[PDB]
Copies of this chain bind each other. A is one copy, B any other.
Amino acid sequence: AVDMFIKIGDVKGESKDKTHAEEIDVLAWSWGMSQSGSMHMGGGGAGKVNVQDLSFTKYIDKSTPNLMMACSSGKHYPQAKLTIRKAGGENQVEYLIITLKEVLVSSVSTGGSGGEDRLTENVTLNFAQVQVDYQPQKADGAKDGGPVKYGWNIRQNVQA
């Protein structure tokens, strides 16, 4: 299973990962986008992209009150970075890195469902800009060329 971490501003989480120490451990995440343009109209049906907030699941931890305060105050962070690393430890390839710029905590949903040794919560992030870098790998796990990159300035509706 892949290892997943998120760094939001200078907020410290409780990750004990060797290279992502004191970031937030990510248990799950989801994100998406859609385009309203249409190919059924012809003549040269232009639309726009809608980019969703990014959702992730974490343990309740020392970041929790800070994220709650960010959500309430509406104060944004300069950057948030979600790192997805291939299973096996800190020498493994960080093959998917999503970087968000101008980051608002749009929701926090917390609780204890019962019978749980570690409580979890869902956080959502709203942001002006997104970068996604994917690192292809060779058969042996080594890097295969440079990363494949996508960058989009949502606020200004142009590529980054």
Determine which of B32, B116, B154 lies in contact with A107 in the assembled complex, contact meaning CB atoms within 8 Å: B32
Which B residues lie within 8 Å of A149 (CB)? 65
Name A30's closest neighbour in chain B (CB-CB): B111
A104-130 interface bits toward B, Cβ cutoff 8 Å, 1 = contact, 0 = none: 111111111111110100001011100
Residues in A28-71 with C-beta less than 8 Å from chain B? 28-35, 37-42, 46-49, 51, 55, 57, 60-62, 64-66, 68-69, 71
Query: In the complex, what residues of B have CB within 8 A of residue A32's CB?
Result: 107-111
Q: CB distance B107 to A34 under 8 Å? A: yes
> A27 and B113: CB pair below 8 A?
yes
Q: Which of A13-29 contact B (CB under 8 A)?
A: 14, 26-29
For A112, what are the chain B residues with a Cβ–Cβ distance below 8 Å? 2, 4, 26, 28-30, 84
Q: Measuring CB to CB, which residues of chain A are less than 8 angstroms from any residue of chain B?
A: 1-2, 4, 14, 26-35, 37-42, 46-49, 51, 55, 57, 60-62, 64-66, 68-69, 71-74, 76, 84, 87, 96, 102-117, 119, 124, 126-128, 132-134, 136, 148-150, 152, 154-156, 159
Q: What are 29 A-B pairs at a CB distance below 8 A?
A: A1-B117, A2-B112, A27-B113, A28-B112, A29-B111, A32-B110, A33-B72, A33-B107, A34-B71, A34-B107, A35-B105, A37-B104, A39-B76, A39-B102, A39-B127, A39-B128, A39-B154, A40-B51, A42-B156, A48-B74, A49-B74, A62-B134, A62-B136, A64-B96, A65-B134, A65-B150, A68-B132, A68-B150, A84-B112
